[PDB]
């Protein structure tokens, strides 16, 4: 996360074991989507006081894992 955040400000964090860049990985898009879904209920949570509904992130990811398993017989 430090690498992804610092990239936008012309700064490249460095680690002694050189990690390949991870700012472009697709999972960060899922991170943004999950954050957007989770915090979109905050106005009602704070003001109205609704019941926090759990994010469907893990359910969707397990669904994707199931889809992969459905036809993942080959050593792909």
């Amino acid at each position: 996360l430090a690498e992804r955040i610092m990239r936008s400000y012309n700064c490249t964090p460095v680690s002694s074991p050189r990690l390949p860049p991870t700012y472009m990985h697709a999972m960060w898009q899922a991170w943004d989507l999950a954050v957007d879904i989770c915090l979109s209920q905050l106005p009602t949570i704070i003001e109205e006081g609704t019941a926090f509904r759990h994010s469907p992130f893990f359910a969707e990811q397990l669904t994707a894992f199931q889809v992969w398993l459905t036809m993942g017989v080959e050593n792909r």
């Binding site: 898009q29 899922a30 943004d32 989507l33 957007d36 469907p56 669904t63 994707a64 889809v67």
Partner: protein, 84 residues
């Protein structure tokens, strides 16, 4: 551009089978389409952006439903601007 529209239509149709892999990418493409529409002052580019938005709406209602307010607000601001 037509191949692009067909690809987005298929991906939107697949938003239900593999949401974990489709929904984030569709969100990112929605981001790019919205900013393209808002910023690009080119008629053809805005035509393609709006057509993309329509395809995404038709094929990914679940994806766009939470973002109804921003998408509608951007469309309104475009509608109030001073090509058919």
């Amino acid at each position: 551009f037509e191949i692009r529209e067909l690809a987005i239509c298929t991906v939107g149709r697949l938003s239900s089978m593999n949401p974990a892999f489709v929904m984030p990418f569709l969100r990112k493409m929605l981001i790019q389409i919205l900013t393209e529409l808002e910023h690009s002052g080119i008629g053809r580019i805005k035509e393609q952006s709006a057509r993309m938005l329509g395809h995404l709406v038709s094929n990914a209602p679940r994806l766009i439903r939470p973002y109804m307010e921003p998408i509608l607000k951007a469309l309104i601001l475009k509608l109030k601007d001073p090509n058919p």
